[model samples]
Target: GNIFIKNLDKSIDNKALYDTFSAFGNILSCKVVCDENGSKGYGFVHFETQEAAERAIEKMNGMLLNDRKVFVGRFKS
Candidate 1:
């Protein structure tokens, strides 16, 4: 399942996302949807499988990503 994770701490970047999600598996990819100024406060994660995605959600969703409490859930739009 794809997830829309938001409110990321701007100090973090792709490496942070990679480092954070690497524990789950080989991250297929991480696409951060940023502001016009290239500031990141949200992004998307694509897992190899739904189960892996779910596991990641269980382990990471609602957990702190950077200094902020990230809100994560299935991206269904």
Candidate 2:
């Protein structure tokens, strides 16, 4: 399952996202969207299993990282 994460801090990057969610389960891929300036404050994490994704969402949603609250959910598309 793919997890959608938003409202991330500008300082958060791909590795930061990966390290945070990796504790939940096996991640197939993880990325933080960014442009020329810096982070776009959103990203996606593809977990190897739906259970892993759910666990991540459950623990991460509305949680604070880098002093900013983030929203984590299952990716619809």
Candidate 3:
């Protein structure tokens, strides 16, 4: 399963987000979005299990990171 994260600070790298969520459970992958506009301030997190993803959504959603609110939710595709 995967979770979508938005409102991330541009400076927040893959390792940073990985470190944050890895504390909750297994994170299979973390992909930070970027384009011409730069660090789109969003990314995707792939967890090893649904429970882990759900845990992240519950704990990290609407939480503050780098002085910005983080939006964490399940990604359907």
Error of 3 at 7 (Å): 0.5
- Over 8-48, each residue of candidate 2 has an lDDT whose tens digit, in order, gives 99999898899999999898899999889899999999998
lDDT of 3 by residue, 52-77 (tens): 99999999999998889999999986
Tell me the lDDT of candidate 1: 0.75
**Model 3 quality (TM-score):** 0.92
Which pairs clash (backbone N, Cα, C closer than 3 Å) in model 2?
none
TM-score of each candidate structure, all chains considered together: 0.82, 0.94, 0.92
The CA lDDT at 74 in model 3 is 91
Lowest lDDT sum, 10 consecutive residues, model 3, at 23-32
* Candidate 1 residue-wise lDDT, 22-47, digit = tens: 67765788777777778568888877
Superposition-based RMSD of candidate 3 using all C-alpha atoms, in angstroms: 1.0
| Highest-scoring model, lDDT | 2
Candidate 3: segments with Cα more than 4 A from true spot: none
State candidate 2's TM-score: 0.94
Q: Which wins on lDDT, candidate 2 or candidate 3?
A: 2
